[PDB]
Every structure is written in structure tokens, then in C-alpha cells.
């Protein structure tokens, strides 16, 4: 069974291409493997984009099947997609990915020292939980 | 151009590498497949061709021309003194075949069987299994033996026994016995193994293995005849008398 349907008004996220990493709203379907898409508030000029370079999300905003960018922009700001998108666990692990890519070597060192001590307090804890389960067993 | 008149080929290629057998004793290439339904029993024995002679019996096949008549039939006598189990051996089932898992011999092996482990009994000091024999009078050794039997109760699939003939009872010249592995077809490996564990160092007469009026297979080495030409080895036609380089 499917949950995400390519339909007029569904917000999609572009995987590859010159716009990789931007939201965009499907306004029309040209043919089977290519859609007329437009993100007005995401710096994406209205254009034809194949269905490969897009990952359709869980956001549907309503507008007629060919309305000009002006009405798409209002429906986009009406639903306030930009803030609602940033609150999804999907976007949060997207922005958490380049945070690990922009990590400076010194920041990579500070992590190594924070990871080391954190894992110590974890492992001795579960150590105290196993010895807490064996006297629980007898 | 084709052959004018057809003729079946001479000799079978199914027996093709017609070479001297690498073995002198007949090898059981395949034992009967077992089923835990039957009681445990040995599946092979080892005898010696004595000779041939007649027999007279009254055939009882109905609807035949020889029904309720007497016939003369050529029979072969095979002298089979009882054999003695001197060890068992387990086999684990692998995707590469059947790998021998573990061998356990009996405590006291007869000298006639020890003959088999030597090429020159006269020169040897007869030391085989002398330090193995010491594993049955110390608790540390015996506590290892049962750990080998218990292990074969877990991992072994097919279990064979090492039996050998008793050359002393035969009128033959040689005294070196013939060792052999006889597969034990029967119940589960557990009851299959303990049956052999108590049969160890015991006699096994042929009457235990076979019964009368039973169909059996005979495995042995053909009577050798040395180097032979094509006429004797494959039974081709002798060429006509006029042939120059031989017919």
C-alpha cells in the first residue's frame, strides 16, 4: 500500500540536479516520467523536472492544477511549509549531515574527547544493569 | 564414410580404467541406506573363496517347466569365520561429503590384527597401540574416552565399526588379518553407538549378519591374468590368416 502520491500540490524534495536540497511543489504532470514543478519560496524557478530528481514528502497544499506562481506562493506561505519542513525528523537529519561534513579538525578533536567520556559513562551504566539483572534472576 | 553393417561395440566403457586394482580386499563403495525403524544390525561381512561344487534341490516356481523337479546348480563355498569388532568410527555429514569425525579402538587388540599395521612383522618391535592401550587403566584416560563417545552421540551421522577376520582359524598361509569398516544400519545414532560399544572385542558370526535364502552382493577383486592383447582383453575379431603384421 502507498502513502505518498504524486498529485497536484504535493511538496517534494529534490535529490540530485543543480537544485539538490530544495523543496518544490508539483503543480502539474506533463507525462508519465516528468512533472511541471515550482518552488516559489525556495528559489526554484517553475520548470519541468523528471520524477527521478525528487523525493515526494508528506506535505500536500491545495491549489488549482495550473495556477500561476502567485497562487502557489500564497498556498505555500499559507501552510507555512518552510517552518513545518524544518521541524520534521527528515530535515533535521539532513542538516545534521552537513554539520558532520563541515566539522573542522579541531571540532573533530573535541568530538573525540566528548565521545570517549560519554561512551564510558554509558558502558559502565549497562554494566551496572547486567549485574542488576543477575541477582534479579536468583 | 559410414560403417556398412552395424555392430555393437566390444566391451563396456562403464568398467573402463582396466588397471590393476589399487586394493586387494574388496571395498564397499556404498552401504545400504539406513532407517531408524529397523533394529541395529551390521551390513557386511568378510569371507574367503574356498571352492565350488554342485547342489540338488526341487524348484518351486509355479508355471515353469521345471516346477517340482530337481535341478543341479553350481554353488560357491565362502569360508567365513566370525569377525571381531576392534573399534568404531563416526562420520559427520558435511557439504563436502562424509568426513570421518573420530576413531576409537578397543583396549586389547589381537596380534593378528596388529599384523595389519606393519609391512615387516619380523623386523618390527610390535609397538602399535601400546601407548594407546594405556588409556583404559587411568581415570584421566577413560574420562576422555566417554567424552569421545558422548561427542559422537551429538555430531556423528553414520557410524561404522572396525572388524577384522581371524587368520588363525583359516588354512591359509598368511596370518595378517583383514581390517574393514562395516556400517551399522539401524536405529538412532545413540542406540546405534551403544550397541557397538558393548560389541567391542566380541565375536560376530556370519549368522548374525545374513540369513538363509537372502540376496547379497559380492565384492572382490577379479582373478588376474596379466598383460593381454585386444583379442583376449576386449574379444575383437581375429583378422584373417593372410594378415602380415599379425592377426
Amino acid at each position: 500500500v502507498f502513502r505518498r502520491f504524486v498529485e497536484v500540490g504535493r511538496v517534494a524534495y529534490v535529490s540530485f540536479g543543480p537544485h539538490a536540497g530544495k523543496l518544490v511543489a508539483i503543480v502539474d504532470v506533463i507525462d508519465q516520467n516528468r512533472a511541471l514543478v515550482d518552488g516559489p519560496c525556495t528559489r526554484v524557478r517553475r520548470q519541468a523536472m523528471p520524477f527521478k530528481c525528487m523525493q515526494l514528502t508528506d506535505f500536500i497544499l491545495k491549489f488549482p492544477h495550473s495556477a500561476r506562481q502567485k497562487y502557489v506562493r500564497k498556498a505555500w506561505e499559507k501552510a507555512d511549509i518552510n517552518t513545518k519542513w524544518a521541524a520534521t525528523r527528515w530535515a533535521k537529519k539532513i542538516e545534521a549531515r552537513e554539520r558532520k561534513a563541515k566539522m573542522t579538525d579541531f571540532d573533530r578533536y573535541k568530538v573525540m574527547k566528548a565521545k570517549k567520556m560519554r561512551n564510558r559513562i554509558i558502558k559502565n551504566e549497562v554494566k551496572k544493569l547486567q549485574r542488576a539483572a543477575l541477582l534479579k534472576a536468583s | 564414410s559410414h560403417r556398412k553393417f552395424s555392430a555393437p561395440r566390444h566391451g563396456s566403457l562403464g568398467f573402463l580404467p582396466r588397471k590393476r586394482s589399487s586394493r586387494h580386499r574388496g571395498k564397499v563403495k556404498s552401504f545400504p541406506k539406513d532407517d531408524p525403524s529397523k533394529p541395529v544390525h551390521l551390513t557386511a561381512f568378510l569371507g574367503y573363496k574356498a571352492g565350488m561344487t554342485h547342489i540338488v534341490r526341487e524348484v518351486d516356481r509355479p508355471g515353469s517347466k521345471v516346477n517340482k523337479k530337481e535341478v543341479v546348480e553350481a554353488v560357491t563355498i565362502v569360508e567365513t569365520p566370525p569377525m571381531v569388532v576392534v573399534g568404531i568410527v563416526g562420520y559427520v555429514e558435511t557439504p563436502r561429503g562424509l568426513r570421518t569425525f573420530k576413531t576409537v579402538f578397543a583396549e586389547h587388540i589381537s596380534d593378528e590384527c596388529k599384523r595389519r599395521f606393519y609391512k615387516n612383522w619380523h623386523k618390527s618391535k610390535k609397538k602399535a597401540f601400546t601407548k594407546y592401550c594405556k588409556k583404559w587403566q587411568d581415570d584421566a584416560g577413560k574420562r576422555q574416552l566417554d567424552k569421545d563417545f558422548s561427542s559422537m552421540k551429538k555430531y556423528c551421522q553414520v557410524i561404522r565399526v572396525l572388524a577384522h577376520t581371524q587368520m588363525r582359524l583359516l588354512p591359509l598361509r598368511q596370518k595378517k588379518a583383514h581390517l574393514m569398516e562395516i556400517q551399522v544400519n539401524g536405529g538412532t545414532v545413540a542406540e546405534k553407538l551403544d550397541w557397538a560399544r558393548e560389541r567391542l572385542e566380541q565375536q560376530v558370526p556370519v549368522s548374525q549378519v545374513f540369513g538363509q535364502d537372502e540376496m547379497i552382493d559380492v565384492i572382490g577383486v577379479t582373478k588376474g591374468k596379466g598383460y593381454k592383447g585386444v583379442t583376449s582383453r576386449w574379444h575383437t575379431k581375429k583378422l584373417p590368416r593372410k594378415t602380415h603384421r599379425g592377426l
Partner: protein, 176 residues
Amino acid sequence: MKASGTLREYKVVGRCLPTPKCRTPPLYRMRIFAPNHVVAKSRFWYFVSQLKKMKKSSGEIVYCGQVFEKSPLRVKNFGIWLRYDSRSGTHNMYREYRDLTTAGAVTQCYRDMGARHRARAHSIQIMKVEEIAASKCRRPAVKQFHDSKIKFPLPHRVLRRQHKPRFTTKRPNTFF
């Protein structure tokens, strides 16, 4: 004419050279779909030489301009009339496509004519391109997109970038 890359629509107008007999010959305009304007001018003379007794040596191109799409942001339904040649005889066809630009629909036709009938671009004479209204289409593969509430999933998402983690650990997921 190789249908290389995406074709473009050119407006080529030409005429016979002025002779003392006819001082100003009449002008002749065509819509040529071609990769570049150089092959458009040659493909222009190919057609003019078929309809008129004119050749490149007796004529001249008075204007070689490219015509742009008046609505590159509207999905349109295009009707195309062809004159391709098979291995046995020639045929007229009427093909429909659904694109944003007439030039994009024509190149969509050359690839489709090359895939369906193994017809190479030099044997096709596209003769008329009419953008038709959705109610007047005929071919059903185009008519099924005329739906105000069109809606469908992408069922079996074939994995792309299947070589970035060439030796990965987890099996890929084909459901989203």
C-alpha cells in the same frame, strides 16, 4: 539531418534571385526543426526544391531566425503529421505528444519514431505541428493525463546511485 540533441524551431524565409524577367520574386517561409541554423538552411532548401523548382544556387535566404516558445511554462498537447519511410514503402502518420515546447515535442517524436519503427531522422518529413486542445486529442496515452485530479504513486523506485557505497552492508529499500 541527424536529430542530435534537442531540436530547435527556425523560421527560414527565402526567394529566387531577382532576374530581369521577374524583378521581385515572392517570398517563401518555412518552419524547420533542426539542431542548429546551419542544417536548418540546408533542410530548408530540401523542401523548397521539392515544392518549387528552386535550388540553393538560384535562391537566397532572406532571414534565418529562431522562433521561441510563446508559453514554455504550460503543458500542451501537440499533434504532428509525419511522412516517414519504412523498409517497404512510405507512410503518413499523425502522432500526438505532450510537452512544453513545440521543439521539445518534435524531438520527442524523432526519438519515438526511431524507437517504434526504427526510422532514422533522414527519412522523416515532419509536415505540420499543431498544438491541439485537450478535448480534441485522439491517442489514449496522452488522453489519460487530462484529469483535474490526477494522482498516482511511484511504485518500484529503481535504486540510482547504486555505486556510491559499492560494497554496502544493508540491503537497499525500494519502497518510499
